[PDB]
Design a protein around this ligand. Structure first.
Ligand SMILES: Nc1ncnc2c1ncn2[C@@H]1O[C@H](COP(=O)(O)OP(=O)(O)NP(=O)(O)O)[C@@H](O)[C@H]1O
Ligand SMILES: Nc1ncnc2c1ncn2[C@@H]1O[C@H](COP(=O)(O)OP(=O)(O)NP(=O)(O)O)[C@@H](O)[C@H]1O
Ligand SMILES: [Mg+2]
Ligand SMILES: [Mg+2]
Lengths: 229, 407, 396, 229
């Protein structure tokens, strides 16, 4: 069952004693390969921080996150980079692009850093930008991009290197209904074809309902667990 | 992707019309190395000129072998001249006295240098305006003529001048004050400094006037070091008689020694501060302008052939910036040190004092000479400075969690 | 919430102390200024102290300047001491300066004698021990001898020394006979200095009687000046007929003057170099203000006028400048050399015994004020450029 | 009546020669007192640029944007600041807060710049935060704030001054359903009582149907102009 991610007792209390806030406390995740997961919840419900901790982008105060059996916390820096460039694709809540690199280079950066063949890199980056919807806006710097198309650039960046896990922090916040539906179509297709597991945090209830598994973050707890079959 | 896929990121640190912030790093390195070049070359010129005012002329600091009819000085001369630190040794007569000139008396130091050792172990013939070597031959006993005597003497070629010995001997008897018939054998049009405080007397008359035999007065030394000369001369005199001690000569130009030490320490403690300024500018440039770039790069980092790929990117960034700055600053420093601008007043019309030209304008002053070895030292230290000042912020930003991208 | 728009500047200055290291690079802007000020203060303080030491210890024992007679003898009522008018003149006295030769029981040497009036503030009366303060009475023919010269000549008190002056000679068939006289020394003048090896102190009346001068005729008027810098420019002052100006810049001891001119030139060179380094480090804050483009554009979106942004960044720069200046003064005064003498035993060849430091208050104040003025003035073009760009902060 | 904002012939083509991409072409708005107005459009169609331009924050290549009769382009800097500090309340597409100031101070900057009494400044800032939902969130800096909390702080920042015109770039892009509903409820209350008018760009269709006037901004053109009664 629990294969791709086994997150146990991960508790995140920032600050020191007698004033620590329970932003994350006793989160348990059993994410399988190809599992369609949607995280929903109100505000300050600890959704972005949960993504940062699962991605190993931060250090959890308590508990552990286990990725492919090998824990991420105990792992070496080189193997962390290997996971982040071959298995983990991260979409931030904000754009967090490189403002000095064009959008094409900003989505090819994972490949240019993973030491791939340049002709393959450019071709697959252009294919991904076409799949996301930036055919005419591939050569524009992020400073000459808008919030939605920067978000689409980030989503493409998390899909370029064919990750096994793609953590997404509000990939549809800055997008309309048409582009949101298109991007979830891409996510469903990658789930069907590549087998990539998408662990996405959204606030739109319809988009989360179009996805197989729902988890509700409230008071730093996982409440809603709905299974039909 | 070995040579091309890593300098790409560091070369893309130009941005859109925002390159005017990294240029303060190239300029920061250029100005630093230029002022370092100017300071080091100026200090070296100072040291060279001062060494021409202490040891090159009037060598001060030596063991005064005080003896009656000294004769076996050959053994000590050979044992001391070849010790490490001494360039050469040469005996001279360091007498003092009065010289007759136009029914007047002039108090002068008699420098009985050796004509046989003049060409080899002295720079007297090399400093003259240039004349035939036979003109400085011994035996005929030609002495240099001075302005203070020639003004009222009107002595020319073929004129013989009488010089009477001061007779400053322990004997109460006159003992025939040596009478020297000097002959004018040349003329100089360089300066009167060599014609007022310096004199030359043949060794025969010097020995005859001493009421003794071949009595040597002093055995002077020409050297290259002055800092270690104290203990060196002390040890050289340690092979002499123990009953005859040596009074220290440090106090004569100890204040000039402290001047040299002061200028050296001030230059060093200001130029390491220029070093600190360059490091500060580079760390400020790489801490704020590009830190979330390192954040998300570490979020999507490479395989791991070398753990510091971000460190390598910033090493290439710092190397490029520091190298271009160092080249520009070295060019500027060399061009400004080698010569000043032909016309100084033209540039500095807007001096800000609303005064014509410059009140303190100087021509062929502030001498300076370049040591390209110092240029290589400053180049290497500037490149190492930029490399460290670009690597340490990189290491600080890499090891922190990528959840420092929002802060 | 101070309603003067300096609240945001203060919050920028104290802010972003996040990981115990970000605050260091945040305060780097004033660290550069305080280090530049430290350098300038220590350079000027050491130069001033060493100049004061050289002007006192060496130059107070030898004559500073002399006024003499252009033609013939010197007539005192032409210009007496009370009528001695010159620029920067501090102390006036009569004196005779003479190049003489001394014959002792061991050998013969040369030197200079200074004939003075013992009733004045003689700088050698404290150094005259084992002897009366004015034992060189007029006609007593008593000359006080120093330490180095006496040790070199092997002569003690009570001996007769033949002092001769070459200027007053006479014709003789056996040679030249100058003015020679035997004088008895009663002790020693341990000056504990450098000049005591060739300088002699004599009365003025007996010296005047020595060179066959008429009644009341002295060699010159000695002036102890106040500054050695203006010496070159003050050689064309009001010197009427029957006088001429001489001094230690080129007549005697010219090596000291030459090395002082060279040291001054290299000192101004190093000062200019440190000043341009200080300019390069004010460019650090000039780019630091340009680094907060997002914040200035957000504030300008808040309806905050561009001149008020100029005031905000000028106040930040001025606060950095004043902090840097006061710390530079603190580390140039309290830590000039006052902490274990910089521990000179290390293999860097440091001389801890030589500490010619004199912290001039006027110089440190003017240096700190200029540093503060530059630190505020360097946020005028960056701030106007920041406020000139409309709130188009799309991460350009 | 159309008094507040009258935008005509507004165009923006500012880029390198030949590549110069146009984003707007002859856009005209008539916004009056209390006109509860919304702009809907696909990403990259020229919505955020339009508000950054009519708010005076950018320089239009051609056309006139006039606020209460006086054009912004001909106006000086001091009066522009006066308008932005008294009449215009801008919610940026992203957070665009001051990282140096806590949430309460980031909210109260307009009041502090308005030369107001601090005693009522703190009270008004606290009122706005308790209305939005961040009474307990005032002591956190933006670096310790979340995307939803940052957007709510920006919304409070644009609403404390009670501006006549409030421009909003995706005010609920990073907000859940409850917070979006509450914030649009506060928007309606401020419109009904204080008489302020909102020009809000949004992608949620239901929140746009909650709006009184709806225009569709796409490809530099205004397509939909719907009036019910
Ligand atoms: N210098 C520029 N100024 C304005 N727009 C530009 C500029 N350069 C490029 N553009 C393009 O023109 C579009 C401007 O429209 P914009 O309003 O930014 O889109 P948007 O409405 O923000 N999409 P969304 O993020 O969903 O709101 C951008 O998508 C850019 O691709
Ligand atoms: N280091 C920190 N210090 C203080 N508070 C923090 C810190 N990190 C997070 N928080 C708070 O803890 C919560 C984090 O939850 P988070 O998942 O980021 O909310 P969010 O869902 O991403 N925002 P949104 O979904 O748009 O409503 C927020 O209330 C933050 O203000
Ligand atoms: Mg937008
Ligand atoms: Mg969130």
């Amino acid at each position: 069952n629990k294969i791709l991610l086994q997150c146990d007792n991960l508790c995140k209390r920032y600050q020191e004693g007698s004033v620590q806030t329970d932003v994350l406390h006793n989160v348990s995740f059993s994410v399988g390969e190809g599992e369609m997961m949607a995280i929903v919840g109100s505000s300050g419900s600890g959704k972005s921080t949960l993504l940062h901790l699962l991605g190993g982008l931060d250090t959890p105060t308590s508990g552990d996150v286990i990725f492919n059996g090998q824990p991420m916390s105990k792992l070496s820096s080189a193997a962390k980079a290997e996971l982040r460039n071959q298995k983990l694709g991260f979409i931030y809540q904000f754009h967090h692009l490189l403002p000095d690199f064009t959008a094409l280079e900003n989505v090819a950066m994972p490949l240019l850093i993973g030491k791939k063949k340049p002709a393959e890199i450019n071709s697959r980056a252009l294919e991904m930008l076409k799949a996301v919807g930036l055919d005419h806006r591939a050569n524009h710097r992020p400073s000459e991009l808008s919030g939605g198309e920067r978000q689409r650039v980030a989503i493409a960046r998390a899909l370029v290197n064919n990750p096994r896990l793609v953590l997404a922090d509000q990939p549809t916040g800055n997008l309309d209904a048409r582009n949101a539906d298109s991007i979830f179509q891409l996510l469903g297709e990658l789930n069907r074809l590549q087998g990539t597991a998408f662990l996405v945090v959204t606030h739109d209830l319809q988009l989360a309902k179009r996805m197989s598994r729902q988890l509700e973050m409230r008071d730093g707890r996982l409440t809603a667990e709905l299974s039909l079959m | 992707s070995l040579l091309i896929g890593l300098r790409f990121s560091r070369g893309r640190r130009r941005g859109g019309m925002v390159s005017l912030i990294s240029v303060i790093s190239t300029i920061g390195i250029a100005l630093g190395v230029a002022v370092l070049i100017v300071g080091l070359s100026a200090m070296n010129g100072f040291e060279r000129e001062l060494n021409n005012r202490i040891l090159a002329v009037v060598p001060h600091g030596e063991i005064e072998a005080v003896d009656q009819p000294w004769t076996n000085w050959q053994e000590a001369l050979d044992h001391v001249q070849k010790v490490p630190g001494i360039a050469a040794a040469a005996p001279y007569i360091n007498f003092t006295g009065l010289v007759e000139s136009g029914a007047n008396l002039r108090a002068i130091q008699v420098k009985g240098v050796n004509p046989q050792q003049e060409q080899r172990l002295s720079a007297l013939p090399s400093f003259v305006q240039g004349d035939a070597w036979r003109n400085f031959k011994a035996g005929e006993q030609q002495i240099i003529i001075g302005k203070g005597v020639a003004d009222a003497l009107k002595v020319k070629q073929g004129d013989w001048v009488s010089i009477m010995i001061p007779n400053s001997n322990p004997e109460h008897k006159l003992m025939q004050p040596k009478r020297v018939r000097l002959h004018v054998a040349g003329i100089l049009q360089l300066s009167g400094q060599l014609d007022h405080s310096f004199a030359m007397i043949p060794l025969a008359d010097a020995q005859q006037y001493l009421d003794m035999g071949s009595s040597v007065s002093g055995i002077a030394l020409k050297m290259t070091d002055v800092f270690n000369a104290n203990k060196l001369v002390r040890d050289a005199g340690e092979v002499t008689n123990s009953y005859v001690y040596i009074k220290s000569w440090i106090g004569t130009y100890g204040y000039m020694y402290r001047d040299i030490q002061m200028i050296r320490a001030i230059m060093y403690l200001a130029m390491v501060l220029v070093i600190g300024v360059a490091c500060f500018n580079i760390v400020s440039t790489l801490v704020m302008a590009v830190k979330d770039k390192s954040g998300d790069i570490a979020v999507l980092r490479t395989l791991g052939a070398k753990d510091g790929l971000i460190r390598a990117i910033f090493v290439w960034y710092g190397l490029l910036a520091g190298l271009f700055g160092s080249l520009c600053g070295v060019i500027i420093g060399v061009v400004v040190s080698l010569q000043l601008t032909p016309i100084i007043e033209w540039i500095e019309k807007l001096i800000g004092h609303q005064f014509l030209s410059s009140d303190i304008y100087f021509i062929d002053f502030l001498p300076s000479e370049l040591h390209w070895l110092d240029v290589f030292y400053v180049l290497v230290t500037a490149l190492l400075l930029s490399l460290l000042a670009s690597w340490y912020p990189a290491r600080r930003a890499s090891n922190i969690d990528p959840a420092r991208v929002l802060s | 919430y101070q309603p003067v728009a300096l609240f945001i500047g203060l919050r920028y200055m104290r802010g972003r102390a996040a990981d115990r290291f970000g605050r260091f690079v945040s305060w780097l802007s004033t660290i550069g200024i305080t280090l530049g000020v430290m350098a300038l203060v220590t350079v000027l303080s050491v130069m001033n102290g060493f100049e004061r030491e050289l002007q006192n210890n060496i130059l107070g024992l030898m004559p500073q300047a002399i006024l003499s007679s252009e033609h013939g003898s010197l007539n005192p009522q032409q210009l007496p001491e009370t009528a001695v008018k010159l620029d920067g003149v501090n102390r006036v006295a009569p004196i005779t300066t003479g190049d003489v030769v001394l014959q002792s029981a061991r050998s013969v040497a040369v030197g200079v004698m200074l004939g003075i009036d013992p009733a004045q503030k003689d700088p050698l009366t404290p150094y005259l021990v084992n002897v009366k303060q004015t034992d060189l009475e007029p006609g007593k023919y008593n000359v006080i001898l120093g330490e180095q010269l006496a040790s070199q000549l092997g002569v003690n008190r009570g001996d007769q020394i033949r002092v001769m002056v070459p200027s007053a000679s006479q014709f003789t068939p056996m040679g030249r006979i100058p003015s020679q006289r035997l004088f008895n020394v009663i002790g020693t003048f341990a000056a504990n200095s450098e000049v005591d090896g060739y300088e002699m102190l004599v009365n003025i009346e007996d010296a005047s009687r020595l060179m066959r001068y008429p009644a009341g005729n002295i060699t010159g008027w000695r002036l102890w000046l106040d500054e050695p810098l203006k010496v070159d420019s003050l050689s064309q002052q009001k010197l009427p007929e029957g006088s001429k100006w001489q001094d230690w810049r080129d007549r005697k001891g010219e090596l000291f003057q030459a090395v002082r001119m060279e040291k001054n030139m290299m000192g101004l060179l190093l000062s200019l170099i440190v000043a341009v380094a200080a300019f390069n480090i004010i460019t650090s804050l000039g780019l630091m203000v340009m680094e907060k483009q997002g914040e200035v554009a957000i504030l300008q979106t808040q309806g905050l006028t561009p001149r008020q942004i100029m005031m905000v960044f000028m106040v930040q720069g001025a606060s950095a400048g004043i902090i840097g200046a006061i710390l530079g003064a603190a580390l140039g005064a309290l830590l000039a050399s006052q902490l274990n003498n910089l521990m000179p035993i290390i293999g860097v060849l440091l001389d801890g015994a030589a500490l010619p430091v004199a912290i001039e208050p006027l110089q440190v104040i003017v240096i700190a004020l200029v540093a503060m003025a530059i630190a505020l003035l360097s946020t005028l073009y960056p701030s106007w450029r920041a406020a000139a760009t409309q709130p188009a902060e799309a991460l350009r």
